[PDB]
Short mmCIF file of C-alpha atoms in Angstrom, two decimals:
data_model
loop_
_atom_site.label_atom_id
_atom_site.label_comp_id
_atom_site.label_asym_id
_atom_site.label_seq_id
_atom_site.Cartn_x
_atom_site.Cartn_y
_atom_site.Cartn_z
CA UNK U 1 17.57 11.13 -13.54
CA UNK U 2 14.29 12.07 -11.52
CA UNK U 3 13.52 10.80 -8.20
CA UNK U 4 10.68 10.41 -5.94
CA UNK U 5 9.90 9.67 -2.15
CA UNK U 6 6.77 7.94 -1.40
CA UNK U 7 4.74 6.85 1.33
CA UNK U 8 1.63 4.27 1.39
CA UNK U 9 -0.44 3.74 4.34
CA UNK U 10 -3.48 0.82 4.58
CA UNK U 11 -5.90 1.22 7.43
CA UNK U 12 -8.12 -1.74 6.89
CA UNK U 13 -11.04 -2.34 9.48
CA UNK U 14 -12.36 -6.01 10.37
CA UNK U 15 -15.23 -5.30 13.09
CA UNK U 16 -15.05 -8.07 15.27
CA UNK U 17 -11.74 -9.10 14.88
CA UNK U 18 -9.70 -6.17 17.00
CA UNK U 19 -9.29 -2.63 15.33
CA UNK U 20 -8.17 -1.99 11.86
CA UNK U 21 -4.72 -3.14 10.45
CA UNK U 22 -2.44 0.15 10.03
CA UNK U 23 0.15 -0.71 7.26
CA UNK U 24 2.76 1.80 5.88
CA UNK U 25 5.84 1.23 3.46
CA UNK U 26 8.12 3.67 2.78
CA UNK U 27 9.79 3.51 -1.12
CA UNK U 28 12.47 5.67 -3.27
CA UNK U 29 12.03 5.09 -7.09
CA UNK U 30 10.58 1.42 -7.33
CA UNK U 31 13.06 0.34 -3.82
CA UNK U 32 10.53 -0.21 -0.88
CA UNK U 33 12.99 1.13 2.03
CA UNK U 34 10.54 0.61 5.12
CA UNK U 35 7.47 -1.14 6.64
CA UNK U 36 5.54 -0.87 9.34
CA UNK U 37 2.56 -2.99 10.45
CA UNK U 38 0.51 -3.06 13.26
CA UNK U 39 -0.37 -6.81 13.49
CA UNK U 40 3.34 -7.77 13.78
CA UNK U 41 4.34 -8.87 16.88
CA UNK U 42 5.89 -5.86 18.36
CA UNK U 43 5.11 -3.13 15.58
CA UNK U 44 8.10 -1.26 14.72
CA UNK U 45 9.40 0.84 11.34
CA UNK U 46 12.04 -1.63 9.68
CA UNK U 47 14.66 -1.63 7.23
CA UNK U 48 13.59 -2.77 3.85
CA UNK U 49 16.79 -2.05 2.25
CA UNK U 50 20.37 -2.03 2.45
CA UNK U 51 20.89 1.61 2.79
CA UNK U 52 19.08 2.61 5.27
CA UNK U 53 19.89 0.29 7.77
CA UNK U 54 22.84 2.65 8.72
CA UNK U 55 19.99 5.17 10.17
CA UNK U 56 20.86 5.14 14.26
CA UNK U 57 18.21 4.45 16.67
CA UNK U 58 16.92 8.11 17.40
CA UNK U 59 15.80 7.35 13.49
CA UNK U 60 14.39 4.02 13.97
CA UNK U 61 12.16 5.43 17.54
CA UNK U 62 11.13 8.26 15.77
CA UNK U 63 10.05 6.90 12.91
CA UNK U 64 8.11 3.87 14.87
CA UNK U 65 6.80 6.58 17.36
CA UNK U 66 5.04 8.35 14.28
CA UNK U 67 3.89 5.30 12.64
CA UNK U 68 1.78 3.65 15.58
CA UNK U 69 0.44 7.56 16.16
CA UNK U 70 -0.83 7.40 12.28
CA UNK U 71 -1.95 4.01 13.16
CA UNK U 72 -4.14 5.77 15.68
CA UNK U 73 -5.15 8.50 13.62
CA UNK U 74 -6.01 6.41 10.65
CA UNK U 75 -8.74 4.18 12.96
CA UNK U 76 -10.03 7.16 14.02
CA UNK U 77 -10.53 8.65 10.51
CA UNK U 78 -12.05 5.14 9.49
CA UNK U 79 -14.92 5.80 13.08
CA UNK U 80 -15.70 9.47 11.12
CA UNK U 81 -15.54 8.01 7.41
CA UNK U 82 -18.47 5.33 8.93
CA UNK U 83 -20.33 9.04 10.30
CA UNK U 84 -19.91 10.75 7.02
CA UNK U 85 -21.06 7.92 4.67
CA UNK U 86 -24.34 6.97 7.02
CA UNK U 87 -22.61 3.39 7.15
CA UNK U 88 -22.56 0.72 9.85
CA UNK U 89 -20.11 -0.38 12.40
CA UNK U 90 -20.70 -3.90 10.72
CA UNK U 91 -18.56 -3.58 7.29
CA UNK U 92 -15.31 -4.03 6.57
CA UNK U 93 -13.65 -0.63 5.08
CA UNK U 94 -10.60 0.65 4.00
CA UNK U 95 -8.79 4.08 4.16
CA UNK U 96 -5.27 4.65 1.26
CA UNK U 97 -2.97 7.46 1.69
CA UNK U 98 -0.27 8.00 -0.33
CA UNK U 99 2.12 11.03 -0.41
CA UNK U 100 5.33 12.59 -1.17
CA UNK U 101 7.92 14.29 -2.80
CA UNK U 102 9.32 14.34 -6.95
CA UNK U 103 12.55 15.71 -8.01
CA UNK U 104 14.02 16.65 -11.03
CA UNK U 105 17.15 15.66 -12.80
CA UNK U 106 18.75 18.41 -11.14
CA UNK U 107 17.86 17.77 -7.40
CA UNK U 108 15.16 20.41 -7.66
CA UNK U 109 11.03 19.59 -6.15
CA UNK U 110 9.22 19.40 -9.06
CA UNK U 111 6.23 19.01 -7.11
CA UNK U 112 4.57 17.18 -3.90
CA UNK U 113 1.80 14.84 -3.28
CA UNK U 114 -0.89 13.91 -0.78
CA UNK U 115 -3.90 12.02 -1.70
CA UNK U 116 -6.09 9.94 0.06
CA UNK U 117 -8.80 7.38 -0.44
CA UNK U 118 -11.72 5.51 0.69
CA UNK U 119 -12.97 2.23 -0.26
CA UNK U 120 -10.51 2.19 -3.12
CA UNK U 121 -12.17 5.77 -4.59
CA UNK U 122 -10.57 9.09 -4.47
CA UNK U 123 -11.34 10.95 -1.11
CA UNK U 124 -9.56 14.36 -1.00
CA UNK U 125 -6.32 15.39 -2.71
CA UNK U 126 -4.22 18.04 -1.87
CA UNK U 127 -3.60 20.15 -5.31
CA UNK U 128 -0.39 21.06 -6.91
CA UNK U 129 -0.12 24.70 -5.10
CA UNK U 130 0.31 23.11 -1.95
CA UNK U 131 -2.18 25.21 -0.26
CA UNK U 132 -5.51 23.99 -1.96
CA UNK U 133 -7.68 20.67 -1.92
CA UNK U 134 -9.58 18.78 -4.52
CA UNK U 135 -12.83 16.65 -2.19
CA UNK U 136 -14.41 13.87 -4.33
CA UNK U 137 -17.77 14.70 -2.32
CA UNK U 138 -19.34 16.00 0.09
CA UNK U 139 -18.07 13.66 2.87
CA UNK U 140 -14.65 14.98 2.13
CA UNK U 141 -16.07 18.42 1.85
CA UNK U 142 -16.32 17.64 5.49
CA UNK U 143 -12.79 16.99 5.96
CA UNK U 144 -11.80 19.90 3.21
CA UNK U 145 -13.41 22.77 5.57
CA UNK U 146 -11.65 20.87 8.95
CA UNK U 147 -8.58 21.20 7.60
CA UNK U 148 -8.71 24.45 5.91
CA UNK U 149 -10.09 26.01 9.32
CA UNK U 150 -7.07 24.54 10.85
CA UNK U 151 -4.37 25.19 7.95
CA UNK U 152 -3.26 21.81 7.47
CA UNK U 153 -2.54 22.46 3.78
CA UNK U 154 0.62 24.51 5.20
CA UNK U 155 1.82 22.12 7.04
CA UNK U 156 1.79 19.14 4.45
CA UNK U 157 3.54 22.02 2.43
CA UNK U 158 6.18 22.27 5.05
CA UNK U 159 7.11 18.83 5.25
CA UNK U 160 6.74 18.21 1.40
CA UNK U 161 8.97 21.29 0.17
CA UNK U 162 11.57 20.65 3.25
CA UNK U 163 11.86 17.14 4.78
CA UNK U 164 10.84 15.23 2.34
CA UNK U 165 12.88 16.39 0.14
CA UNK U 166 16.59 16.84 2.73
CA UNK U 167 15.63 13.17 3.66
CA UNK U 168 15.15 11.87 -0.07
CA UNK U 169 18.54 13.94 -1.08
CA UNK U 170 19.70 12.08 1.77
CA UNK U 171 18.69 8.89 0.70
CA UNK U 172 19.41 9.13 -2.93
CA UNK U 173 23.42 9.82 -2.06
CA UNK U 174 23.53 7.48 0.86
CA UNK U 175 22.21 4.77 -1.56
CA UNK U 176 23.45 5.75 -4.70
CA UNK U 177 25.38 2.55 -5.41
CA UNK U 178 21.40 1.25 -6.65
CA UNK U 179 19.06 4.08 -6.35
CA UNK U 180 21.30 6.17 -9.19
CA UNK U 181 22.01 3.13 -11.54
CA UNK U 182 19.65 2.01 -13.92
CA UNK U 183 19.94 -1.53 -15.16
CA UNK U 184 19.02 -1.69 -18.96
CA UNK U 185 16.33 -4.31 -20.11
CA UNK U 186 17.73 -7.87 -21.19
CA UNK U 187 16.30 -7.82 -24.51
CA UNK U 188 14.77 -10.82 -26.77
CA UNK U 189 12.08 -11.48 -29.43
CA UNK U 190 10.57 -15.26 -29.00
CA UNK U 191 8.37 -16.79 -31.82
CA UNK U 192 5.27 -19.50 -31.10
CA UNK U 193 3.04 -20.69 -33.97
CA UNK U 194 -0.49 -20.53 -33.06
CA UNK U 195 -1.30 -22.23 -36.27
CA UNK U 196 -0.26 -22.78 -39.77
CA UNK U 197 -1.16 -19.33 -40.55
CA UNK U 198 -0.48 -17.39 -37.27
CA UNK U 199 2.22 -17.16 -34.66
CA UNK U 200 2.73 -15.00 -31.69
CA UNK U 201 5.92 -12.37 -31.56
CA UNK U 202 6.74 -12.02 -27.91
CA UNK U 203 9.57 -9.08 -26.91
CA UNK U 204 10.94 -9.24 -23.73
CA UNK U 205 12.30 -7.05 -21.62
CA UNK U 206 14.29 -8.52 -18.37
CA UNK U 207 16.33 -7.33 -15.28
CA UNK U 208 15.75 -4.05 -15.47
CA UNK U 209 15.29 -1.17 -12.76
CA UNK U 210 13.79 1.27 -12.67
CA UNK U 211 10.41 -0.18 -13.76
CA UNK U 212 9.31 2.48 -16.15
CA UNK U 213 9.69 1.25 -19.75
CA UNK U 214 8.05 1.25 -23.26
CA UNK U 215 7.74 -1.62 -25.46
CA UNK U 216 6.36 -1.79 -28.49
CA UNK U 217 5.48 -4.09 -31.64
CA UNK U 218 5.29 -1.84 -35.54
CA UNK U 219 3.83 -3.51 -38.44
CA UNK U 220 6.10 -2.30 -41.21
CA UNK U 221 6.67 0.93 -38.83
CA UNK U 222 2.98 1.68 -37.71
CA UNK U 223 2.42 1.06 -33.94
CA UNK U 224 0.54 -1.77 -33.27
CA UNK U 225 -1.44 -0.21 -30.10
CA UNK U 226 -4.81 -1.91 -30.60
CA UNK U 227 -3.47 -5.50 -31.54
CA UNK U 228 -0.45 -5.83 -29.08
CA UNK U 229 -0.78 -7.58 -25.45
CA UNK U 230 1.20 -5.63 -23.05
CA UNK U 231 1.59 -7.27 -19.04
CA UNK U 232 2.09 -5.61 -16.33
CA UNK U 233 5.95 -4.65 -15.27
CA UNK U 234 5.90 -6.93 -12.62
CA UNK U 235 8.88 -7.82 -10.00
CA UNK U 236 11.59 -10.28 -10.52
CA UNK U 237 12.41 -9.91 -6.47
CA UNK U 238 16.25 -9.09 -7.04
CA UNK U 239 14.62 -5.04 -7.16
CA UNK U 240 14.66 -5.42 -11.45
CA UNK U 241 11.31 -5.98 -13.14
CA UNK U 242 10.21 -7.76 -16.46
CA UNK U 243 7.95 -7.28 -19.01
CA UNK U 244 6.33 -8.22 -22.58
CA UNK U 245 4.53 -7.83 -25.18
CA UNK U 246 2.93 -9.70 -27.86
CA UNK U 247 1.49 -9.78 -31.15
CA UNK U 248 -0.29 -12.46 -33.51
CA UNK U 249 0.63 -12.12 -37.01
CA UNK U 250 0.54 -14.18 -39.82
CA UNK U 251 3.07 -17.06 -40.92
CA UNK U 252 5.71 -15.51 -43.57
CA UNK U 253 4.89 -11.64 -42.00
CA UNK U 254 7.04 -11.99 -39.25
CA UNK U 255 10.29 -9.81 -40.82
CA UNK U 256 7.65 -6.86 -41.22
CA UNK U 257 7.22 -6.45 -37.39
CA UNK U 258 9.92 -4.64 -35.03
CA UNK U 259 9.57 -4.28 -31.08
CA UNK U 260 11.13 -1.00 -29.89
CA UNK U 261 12.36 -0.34 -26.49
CA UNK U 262 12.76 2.53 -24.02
CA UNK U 263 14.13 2.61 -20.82
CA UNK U 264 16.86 4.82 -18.96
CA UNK U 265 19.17 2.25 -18.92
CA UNK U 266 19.30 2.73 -22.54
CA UNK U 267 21.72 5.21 -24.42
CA UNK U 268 19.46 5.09 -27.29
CA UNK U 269 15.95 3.17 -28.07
CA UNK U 270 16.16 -0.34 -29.36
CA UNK U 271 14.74 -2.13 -31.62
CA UNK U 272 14.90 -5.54 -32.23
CA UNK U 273 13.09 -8.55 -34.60
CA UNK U 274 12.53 -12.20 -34.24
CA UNK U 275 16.38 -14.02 -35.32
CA UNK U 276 15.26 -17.31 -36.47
CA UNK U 277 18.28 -19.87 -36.07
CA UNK V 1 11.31 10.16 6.89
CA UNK V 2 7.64 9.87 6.89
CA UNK V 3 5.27 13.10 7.40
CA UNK V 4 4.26 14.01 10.68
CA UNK V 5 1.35 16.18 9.99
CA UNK V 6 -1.61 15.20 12.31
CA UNK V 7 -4.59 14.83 9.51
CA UNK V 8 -8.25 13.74 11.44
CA UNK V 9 -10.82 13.48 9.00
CA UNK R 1 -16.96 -1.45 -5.21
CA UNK R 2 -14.39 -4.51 -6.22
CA UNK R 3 -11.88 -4.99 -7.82
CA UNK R 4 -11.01 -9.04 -8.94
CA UNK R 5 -6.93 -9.54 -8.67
CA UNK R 6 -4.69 -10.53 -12.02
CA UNK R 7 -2.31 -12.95 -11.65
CA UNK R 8 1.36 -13.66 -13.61
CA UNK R 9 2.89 -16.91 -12.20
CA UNK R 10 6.58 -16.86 -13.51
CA UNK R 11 10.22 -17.36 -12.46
CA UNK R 12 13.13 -14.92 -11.31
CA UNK R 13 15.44 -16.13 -13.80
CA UNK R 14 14.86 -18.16 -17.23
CA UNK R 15 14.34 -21.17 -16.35
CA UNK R 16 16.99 -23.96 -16.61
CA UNK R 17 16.35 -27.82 -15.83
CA UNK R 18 18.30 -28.42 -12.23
CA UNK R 19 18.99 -24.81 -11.75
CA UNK R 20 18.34 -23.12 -8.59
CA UNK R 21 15.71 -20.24 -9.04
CA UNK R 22 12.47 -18.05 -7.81
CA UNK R 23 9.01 -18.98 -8.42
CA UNK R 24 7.08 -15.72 -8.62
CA UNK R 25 3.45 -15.39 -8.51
CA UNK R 26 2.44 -11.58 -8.49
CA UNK R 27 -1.29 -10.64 -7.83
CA UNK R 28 -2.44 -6.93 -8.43
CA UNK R 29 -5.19 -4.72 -9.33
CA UNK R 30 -6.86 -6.10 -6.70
CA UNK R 31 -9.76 -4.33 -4.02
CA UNK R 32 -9.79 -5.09 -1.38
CA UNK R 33 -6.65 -6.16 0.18
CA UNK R 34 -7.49 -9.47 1.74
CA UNK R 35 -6.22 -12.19 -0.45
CA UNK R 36 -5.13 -15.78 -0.15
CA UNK R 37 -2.32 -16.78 -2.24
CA UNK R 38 -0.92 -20.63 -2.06
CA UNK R 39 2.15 -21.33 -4.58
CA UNK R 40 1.56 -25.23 -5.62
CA UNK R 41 4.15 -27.81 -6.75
CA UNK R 42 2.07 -31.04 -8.62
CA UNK R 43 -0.92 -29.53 -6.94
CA UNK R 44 0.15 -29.49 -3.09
CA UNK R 45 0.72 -26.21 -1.63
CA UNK R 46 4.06 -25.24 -0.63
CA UNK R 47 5.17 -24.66 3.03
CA UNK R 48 7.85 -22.22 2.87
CA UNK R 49 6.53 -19.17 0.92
CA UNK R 50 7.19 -15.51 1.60
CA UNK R 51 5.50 -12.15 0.10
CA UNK R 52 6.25 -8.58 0.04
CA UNK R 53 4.46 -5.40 2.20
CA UNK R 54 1.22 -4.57 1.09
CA UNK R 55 1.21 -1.27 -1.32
CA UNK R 56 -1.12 -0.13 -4.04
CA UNK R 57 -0.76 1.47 -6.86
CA UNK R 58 -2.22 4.88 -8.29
CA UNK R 59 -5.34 3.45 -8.88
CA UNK R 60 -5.76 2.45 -4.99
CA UNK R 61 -5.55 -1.11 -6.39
CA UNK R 62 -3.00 -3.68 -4.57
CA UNK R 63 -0.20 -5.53 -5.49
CA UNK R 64 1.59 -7.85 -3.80
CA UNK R 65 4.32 -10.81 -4.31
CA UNK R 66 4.53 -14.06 -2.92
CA UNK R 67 7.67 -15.91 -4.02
CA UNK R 68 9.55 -19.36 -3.21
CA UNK R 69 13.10 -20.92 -3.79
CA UNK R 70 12.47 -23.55 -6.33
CA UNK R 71 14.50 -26.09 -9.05
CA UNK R 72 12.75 -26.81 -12.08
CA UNK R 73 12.61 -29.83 -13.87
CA UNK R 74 11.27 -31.09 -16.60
CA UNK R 75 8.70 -32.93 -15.38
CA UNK R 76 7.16 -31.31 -12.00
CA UNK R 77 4.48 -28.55 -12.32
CA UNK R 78 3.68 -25.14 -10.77
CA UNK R 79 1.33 -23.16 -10.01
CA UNK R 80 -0.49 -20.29 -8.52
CA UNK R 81 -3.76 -20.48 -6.71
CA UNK R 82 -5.25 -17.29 -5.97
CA UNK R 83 -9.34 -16.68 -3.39
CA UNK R 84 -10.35 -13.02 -3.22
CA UNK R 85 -13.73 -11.84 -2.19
CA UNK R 86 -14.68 -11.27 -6.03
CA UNK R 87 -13.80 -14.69 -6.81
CA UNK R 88 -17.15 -17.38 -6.58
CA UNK R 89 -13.52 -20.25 -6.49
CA UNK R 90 -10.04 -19.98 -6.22
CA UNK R 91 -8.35 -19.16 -9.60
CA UNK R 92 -5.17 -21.55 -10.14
CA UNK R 93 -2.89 -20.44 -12.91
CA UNK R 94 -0.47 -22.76 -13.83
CA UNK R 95 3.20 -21.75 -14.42
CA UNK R 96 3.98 -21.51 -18.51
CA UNK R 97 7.99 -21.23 -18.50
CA UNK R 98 7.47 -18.98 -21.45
CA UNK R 99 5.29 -16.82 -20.12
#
């Protein structure tokens, strides 16, 4: 299938209570493989999954090294973000970056990322080419002509068409026990009266990985978009997720609704109905 | 392997 | 400029009367990160509870999980109890083994 690289970094200021928290994680897919964070006790990059504990130390330095200089940069970028919004040293703010690399089925980039963010709102994005950036205002207008004037587009370019994508190659066959299997959904329909005249249809969808997935409910074979209550995929914490989705629909209807599901793990969509006894 | 592209606002 | 978290409070596994398992409460869509999560067991808060890194999602919004080893029974209760700036209380939200 496709595969991604991504990394997130936090930088989270608290004046008065020392300089901002720098956090990063490093994932492949939906597996976190790093952390770092600079309120632990002695801040260092760390293993977050099985694989990648085989890196040597040259791999664990270097990548620690980097991570307390973004630390750095990322409290300085929070002093100027205070300069370009006319804000006080008083508040609490909060710079996102998240970046990376997407391949295709075939091993080939399909494209790179590098966004960033203030105060939960789109800051600057670099676009698609590589080589051009989208600014949200005219702070990051600011930033946009810095960086242009120093050509920082080609160098995100560099890393995101070369080592992002040797290291995720890397990655993907030095963990390819988990990152290349999918798990297919553990599949169910449950059934709860709501009342003598209603019940609810829950599908569920369990143990599966990655998290991307499509579930469904059809009312004799019309999609039920507007009338079904979909959660969040959320984490089971053994790396598979879960996930369901309901419908209310009346007493003696229930054989007219279907749940259809899609995930990789799946040779072919499913679909499935409420088995009574 | 993270990115090690200095980027000052 | 906020975003208030949702919460799912659920287990690893199905759960099974006796049977060794995960209690799960996930909090996301959240803004800004600060967050106090306390899992609960008959209303006290448990001791030994662990959560993931801090990420976000596309949206800037986080997520995070805080999980415990638990066994179910029939009788004891669970829960989630969740204070975020946007919240004027703390939101508990009990576990529903179906849900």
């Amino acid at each position: 299938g496709s595969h991604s690289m991504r990394y997130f970094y936090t930088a989270m200021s608290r004046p008065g209570r020392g300089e901002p928290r720098f956090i990063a994680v490093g994932y492949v897919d939906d597996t976190q493989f790093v952390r770092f964070d600079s309120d632990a006790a002695s801040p260092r990059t760390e293993p977050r999954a099985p694989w990648i504990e085989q890196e040597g130390p040259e791999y664990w330095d270097g990548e620690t090294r980097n991570m307390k200089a973004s630390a750095q940069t990322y409290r300085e970028n929070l002093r100027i973000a205070l300069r370009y919004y006319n804000q006080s040293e008083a508040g609490s703010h909060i710079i996102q970056r998240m970046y990376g690399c997407d391949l295709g089925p075939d091993g080939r980039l399909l494209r790179g990322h590098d966004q960033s963010a203030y105060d939960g709102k789109d800051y600057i994005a670099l676009n698609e080419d590589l080589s051009s950036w989208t600014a949200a205002d005219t702070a990051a207008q600011i930033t946009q002509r810095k960086w242009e004037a120093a050509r920082v587009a080609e160098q995100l370019r560099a890393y995101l068409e070369g080592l992002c994508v040797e290291w995720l190659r890397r990655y993907l066959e030095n963990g390819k026990e988990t990152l290349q299997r999918a798990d297919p959904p553990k599949t169910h329909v449950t059934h709860h009266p709501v009342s003598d005249h209603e019940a609810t249809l829950r599908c569920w969808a369990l143990g599966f990985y990655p998290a991307e997935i499509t579930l469904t409910w059809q009312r004799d074979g019309e999609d039920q978009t507007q009338d079904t209550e979909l959660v969040e995929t959320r984490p089971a914490g053994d790396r598979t997720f879960q996930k369901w989705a309901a419908v209310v629909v009346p007493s003696g209807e229930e054989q007219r609704y279907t749940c259809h599901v899609q995930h990789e793990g799946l040779p072919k969509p499913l679909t499935l109905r409420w088995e009574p006894s | 392997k993270a990115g090690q592209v200095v980027t000052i606002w | 400029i906020q975003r208030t978290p949702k919460i799912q409070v659920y287990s690893r596994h199905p759960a099974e009367n006796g049977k060794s398992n995960f209690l799960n409460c996930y909090v996301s869509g959240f803004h800004p990160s600060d967050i106090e999560v306390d899992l609960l067991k008959n209303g006290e808060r448990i001791e030994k509870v662990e959560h993931s890194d801090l990420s976000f999602s596309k949206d800037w919004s986080f997520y995070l999980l805080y999980y415990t080893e638990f066994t179910p029974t029939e009788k004891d209760e669970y829960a989630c109890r969740v204070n975020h700036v946007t919240l004027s209380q703390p939101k508990i939200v009990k576990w529903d083994r179906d849900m």
